[PDB]
Write a protein that binds this ligand. Structure first.
Ligand SMILES: CCCCC/C=C\C/C=C\CCCCCCCC(=O)O[C@H](COC(=O)CCCCCCCCCCCCCCC)COP(=O)([O-])OCC[N+](C)(C)C
Ligand SMILES: CCCCC/C=C\C/C=C\CCCCCCCC(=O)O[C@H](COC(=O)CCCCCCCCCCCCCCC)COP(=O)([O-])OCC[N+](C)(C)C
Ligand SMILES: CCCCC/C=C\C/C=C\CCCCCCCC(=O)O[C@H](COC(=O)CCCCCCCCCCCCCCC)COP(=O)([O-])OCC[N+](C)(C)C
Ligand SMILES: CCCCC/C=C\C/C=C\CCCCCCCC(=O)O[C@H](COC(=O)CCCCCCCCCCCCCCC)COP(=O)([O-])OCC[N+](C)(C)C
Ligand SMILES: CC(C)CCC[C@@H](C)[C@H]1CC[C@H]2[C@@H]3CC=C4C[C@@H](O)CC[C@]4(C)[C@H]3CC[C@]12C
Ligand SMILES: [K+]
Ligand SMILES: [K+]
Ligand SMILES: [K+]
Lengths: 450, 450, 450, 450
């Protein structure tokens, strides 16, 4: 049995192992620096530390059971999985993180949880869980902000622990900069110790600076270094949030850039204000209805097989419904589906006029066309989605009375979204299906002579 | 009767409903936290709250009357509109926002406007009005900054209300951090209460921090959380403004990148300093005159129908004015208009020399050409906009005495902006208009034999 | 006589008129707010104000003499220039800025230079000078930073003047927030007044906040508004500098993105480490020698005429030096120059091997090729820049003994930078020059039969 | 002997010369401003200054020995190298930086190391070492952050030195703003002097501002200027880090933009949820396995020679293994290798079905294909990497019984990564190898008639 590293079980385990990694990264330093926190809840700390070590062991076992992909297949041989694990640097990191340093609790004493700092070497699982969540969630930016806030709170917490440890080393209350005397009823309280240390660290790492100024040299050095770290942290927060904001409205920026370029062209080329407003309305329609992306330039990112599967799933039924293509083989229908070109029209747009060159066949997807008269108001027929026209105009039919010309005025009652099959496209598709070509042309001949 | 959600009436209603949504989002919390604000203007608050509730009801009715687009047409059947509304989550939000919680004024008392916090669930209308304004205004960046400032002021106001409520819960003046005693003549005044709370909130959310430091633990916790919120707010302000600044000068950045790439090529390829200055002057002209965008790569964003309409509206009159195309059918003229290629020239640029291969026909749009002699200074004719030349050089005329060669020196008197119709383009256009082809070639023959 | 708005005279005048616009924008408010500054140097202020008004008059005259571009030519008819000026909004702004408000000095007194605030309506000239400098200087980013600093200093100066005016209106020293008593020997000094106001404004607009806190309500309101303005100013500074930094290393970012994509391909496709290092060295060479931009994709931004002029100026001499093209007409040589394809090679790269298909002709630009033996170390000939080979392999010569195959091993002694003329390119170029084709092929025949 | 300016020796020397440049840039100002630092370690300062001057001399000699690239070859003539050095501005800068100003130690005294400020003119070597490291290291962003921190620490150090010099000029302790009296036991200590000056400079340049406010005017001016410098420094830090963060996740941003565009297309085109999940899984696979970049659009950045070398090194062995191409000449095999098109498939994807048009030949690279029956579960053969099929379907073999159709159902057992050689590609490749074409077709005939 092997875990697919792209499945849900692997992600759930990433969460499960991120829990003790976060617990260690937040609490080992907190118990190392705030001695009362370590010595007053030592029973809970023992339980939680050894549950975390058990979960680390289970993480190593899982990492022996996680199949990597070789020759496009998931490797599921225990020998190969264990070999790829042990050969990896992650195995060394996991072994180091699992090295029993709690045995120093007998020599050093119960006031040294620093020994469990090796548990921090499982950071890879936590970072991997975050990376996987970011590529998995429906809210990538909400999670991105949550992850940024988590990093910032952990850095501020670590810096608070460092401030309290520096105050302890210098001596609580020995000068006005360090944390005050812990023999005071108010500032000797563990909640106060941690919360004032966190307040100090937030003041310093967010470059507010409303803390008692340093007294001693080491304090000046540490406060300088910590102000610089805080400047870098603030710059990183701003950089991350600004990169996220850029990516959030990069689509709108690109769309508005296209709009502005076309406005510039139109105003420069003295396009009439009527057509200028028609173009502005068209782009408003595109943005409002989430059709700003070009179908061709969007499907180009897919592979040929997956793009063909998409095209089939979208077009094959309506293309079979066409009468000429009703009884042609499947490979030809796929070759034709791959050659449909989307043509979107506005309300009142004429798809065809009587006398236009008919070189293309149109299929209606999500639209309503009106066969109208020369006056352009009288609707003979209303062609809805799934319907089509011009299927004879794309056939080379020997002896055609009326050809190469549209005999109807096809108008868009609004936002028709047609899909077009040109004559050259049909010929290129038929170049490998000659019996299909002759059968199609004979069927069109039967249609005409009717 | 149905409202077009892309028209002016819908946008005006978005403003009308954004007014009470903003009123609620700003004033419900302010009256909940500053008790004197609620109890001293309770008559105005009742009037405004119930006008807001009436506008919320009208918003729900409007949302039953707002037509969505189906099959490219605006749905205007009351059954379908009401069904799409009630099925939407927005309907649930509107019902929750309209749930009468003012009835708690009888149980809780007049000092609990918190009950109207459900009115904040109409935020969707306000956000939609902002989104629509951004895509509608001539000043997207001015409105973007105004909207950012509005969000920031509302967040600072909410945080001021939270600070005052925390001071109230802890006790006004009980320590030096909370808002002072409200029994003081100066700090017991409602204007002072709100303005000092707003000052505190601005100091905290903008990471200035010149406030009295926390005394109690909860105050330390809240000040840490509020400093972190303020860091995130500042990072968001910077990210939004920097994204806006990037988008504002992204066109200039792209243009300067092209300029620098061409400068790099020229300096590397040892292009003569004369031509190097000619290229620099050309790009200065492009930028100064708002022609930096490539016409082809700009019109590629349009649909084929709208691009054809643009091309017609720009070129069809000058193309009809041509003598050979004077009496050819309209479909051919559109097919030709779609094949004109813009060619811009600099002052003194030769479009043609005597002996150059004449394979292209030129139409002058916004320019002045000079038919000059071999010396290149004597102007025979001055060809202005609308004029053309080379229309015979694009015809395959059987038995042509002088062909394939230009017989004139056509020079640009400056920034001519020609539109070119090549011979291959005319042939590809005529491939579907054979009688047009034979008539064009016979007309060119009559022109030559003249 | 008419000024070219793209020439040096117009830019020099932009500087000349920006001087009084900057003087007004900085000094009118300073004299309005700091009364001793206005009343102690009133003689210098009169001289400077009226020199500024004279320069504003000369600016209006210049703007009547500035030719706009119509039909690609510079309009230089005084009637048309004056009409385009007076019809413009800039003319209204200039008239308003020149409205004599100094006449109020008789009614209001010498302590009211606020009357000259209309002179600030010439801001367009200053902004235009900055916009022109940015597109003109060799140091766009240095000037960009200087312009940002100028804007920031002017905003801080204006805010300092506003702080001093608010202190004056409330009363100097009436509370601890306003500017102190100006009857003090130290704080009553004009240098102190301005420099402390500027210090206050810098503390507030840069969100440092180390100022005496507000006492009164209006002071709280103003300090809140000024902190928010300062947050927006800081965000704008960061946005501008970050946009500038992005544009500064966008070329390196794009290049490194290409490098990383190719590294990803190579590592994935298991490209041998030898070729992997060859590719890395090639990209290091490209970046180190400023050849990262693709010649084709760089020249595509030029117009056809200017791209042809570049190609001629780069290639025409070496292409004439070729023996087959020695006596062919100029249009054909230009058509061929436009078809040379750059081919860059690395040291030791073989351009041709004995037996390779010879379909292309090579011209050496900035390189050294070695005709070597089959062993590949013995150099028969060393082909330098300007030299060429393969000119027969691109000719269709009837009855060729040895054709379609390279008879030499051409090796690159390092970074050869060849330009290639394929056979298909020569045929496409000759399709319009048939006598050139027959003469070229007969010349190649004479070469072969020799 | 000449140093390659792109080799390891040149980079090592860049480090060696950056050491004394950094030493000068950090210590000359520190000794100039902190007089006890200069006068208490004067022996170490003499040793280090003259070691730095020796290294500057060696840098000038190295710069005479650094070969530039001319005609693609490394210039290694001492005359030309020395000429290009002395003609350069860098030679003038090096001479100025080496001008003996230590001779002023006899006139000015040992308390004036300012004389060595000319040594700062070697900044070019330091900046060049940084630029070279950035384009050389495996950790460009880590080094980028380190270099930013180095610049910031040097600016803060310089500003600390400036603050101490201003305090000295005004007088230590003369007011509450300057550095206090240096006759105090605590603040007269050199460690305290420097560390408090550095603390002051960090407070000021990071816009924290928790320093004693200015007393005198010059102090107000300097503090304003230094706050503005610090605002610019913070904006530059944020801009650099945000540009780095943008470039770090620009690949993920582009990939997610493609994903979102395809999601938009699919949801709009009503693609079935099955295929929608198939596309999402495909993109997850692409990102997880570092194959997000399109092979064609990635290799387009390479030159033709290097792209051909890559293609050969990747494909030539498997292409030779093909039976029809087993004994064809090498130029044809390279022409064919350059025409392989990557086709990646998903588990269960059918590469071919019985009856599909066989126009393409497939080679398996990193995959496993299964020849299956019409039911699609029974595997006849399992085709692994290196294997191929369809090599007859790409040959025009006179008199072929079964052609143009696939006779097998080829299925992907998962992530097959095939490389395709179409029939048109083979024909275009054979157009220059006619004997290869006839031999290939006769070999295919022998295969068929077998
Ligand atoms: C850091 C290196 C120096 C650490 C010395 C700690 C012990 C100590 O600072 O030793 C001090 C002696 O002052 C020193 O040697 C150091 C003086 C100057 C140190 C300069 C530090 C450079 C800061 C730039 C760092 C920026 C990086 C930020 C990255 C984002 C004794 O300490 P004291 O407080 O107990 O004496 C009671 C008073
Ligand atoms: C927040 C969780 C704790 C809230 C406790 C409030 C009541 C209280 O703080 O309880 C306190 C007891 O201290 C505590 O338990 C909490 C001590 C430590 C809390 C650590 C807070 C983590 C902060 C990171 C948050 C960053 C997120 C920002 C996102 C942008 C009693 O309050 P007191 O002031 O009345 O005692 C008079 C003195
Ligand atoms: C601003 C609107 C209020 C101005 C009132 C000035 C005179 C005055 O503040 O009137 C005050 C009375 O307080 C008021 O009415 C106003 C109280 C609340 C005003 C709320 C201001 C909203 C701030 C958000 C603005 C953010 C925009 C920043 C964009 C970047 C009397 O003034 P006092 O100092 O002489 O009384 C001696 C004590
Ligand atoms: C700077 C120009 C003035 C320097 C005067 C120094 C000596 C002195 O400030 O002279 C002062 C006299 O005040 C002055 O003339 C200057 C008054 C106003 C100066 C305005 C400075 C403009 C600031 C904007 C700069 C922003 C650029 C930042 C770029 C990022 C005497 O000095 P004191 O302190 O010995 O008098 C004891 C009290
Ligand atoms: C990094 C952040 C998010 C995690 C902070 C964890 C630690 C350091 C903090 C947060 C919760 C805090 C606890 C909150 C409440 C109490 C109860 C109090 O009567 C004694 C201390 C004690 C138990 C605190 C000790 C410090 C503490 C455990
Ligand atoms: K600050
Ligand atoms: K502060
Ligand atoms: K501050």
């Amino acid at each position: 049995v092997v875990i697919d590293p792209s499945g849900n079980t692997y992600y759930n385990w990433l969460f499960c192992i991120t829990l003790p990694v976060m617990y260690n990264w937040t609490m080992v330093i907190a118990r190392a620096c705030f001695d009362e926190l370590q010595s007053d809840y030592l029973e809970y700390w023992l339980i939680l530390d050894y549950v975390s070590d058990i979960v680390y062991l289970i993480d190593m076992f899982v990492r022996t059971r996680t199949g990597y992909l070789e020759q496009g297949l998931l490797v599921k041989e225990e020998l190969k999985l264990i070999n790829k694990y042990k050969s990896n640097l992650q195995f060394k990191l996991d072994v180091l993180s699992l090295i029993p340093t709690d045995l120093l609790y007998f020599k050093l004493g119960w006031n040294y949880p620093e020994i469990r700092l090796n548990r921090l070497l499982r950071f890879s699982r936590m970072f991997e869980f975050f990376q996987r969540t970011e590529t998995r969630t429906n809210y990538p930016n909400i999670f991105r902000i949550s992850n940024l806030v988590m990093y910032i709170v952990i850095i501020i917490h670590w810096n608070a622990c460092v401030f309290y440890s520096i105050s302890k080393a210098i001596g609580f209350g020995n000068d006005t900069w360090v944390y005050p005397d812990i023999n005071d009823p108010e500032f000797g309280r563990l909640a106060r110790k941690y919360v004032y240390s966190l307040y100090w660290s937030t003041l310093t790492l967010t470059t507010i600076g409303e803390t008692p100024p340093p007294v001693r040299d080491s304090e000046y050095v540490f406060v300088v270094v910590d102000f610089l770290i805080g400047v870098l942290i603030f710059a990183t927060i701003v950089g991350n949030i600004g990169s996220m904001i850029s990516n959030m409205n990069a689509a709108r920026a690109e769309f508005q850039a296209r709009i502005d370029a076309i406005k510039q062209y139109m105003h420069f080329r003295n396009v009439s204000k009527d057509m200028e407003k028609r173009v502005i309305k068209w782009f408003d329609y595109l943005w409002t209805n989430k059709k700003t992306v070009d179908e061709k330039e969007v499907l180009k990112y897919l592979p040929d097989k997956l793009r063909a599967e998409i095209a089939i799933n979208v077009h094959l039924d309506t293309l079979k419904k066409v009468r000429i293509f009703a009884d042609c083989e499947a490979g030809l229908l796929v070759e034709l589906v791959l050659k449909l070109q989307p043509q979107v029209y506005s309300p009142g747009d004429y798809i065809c006029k009587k006398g236009d060159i008919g070189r293309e066949m149109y299929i209606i997807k999500e639209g309503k066309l009106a066969v109208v008269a020369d006056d352009g108001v009288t609707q003979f027929v209303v062609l809805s989605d799934g319907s089509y026209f011009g299927e004879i105009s794309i056939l080379n039919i020997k002896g055609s009375k009326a050809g190469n010309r549209r005999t109807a005025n096809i108008k868009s009652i609004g936002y028709s979204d047609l899909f077009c099959l040109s004559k050259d496209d049909l010929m290129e598709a038929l170049t490998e299906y000659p019996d299909a070509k002759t059968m199609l042309e004979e069927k069109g001949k039967q249609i005409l002579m009717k």
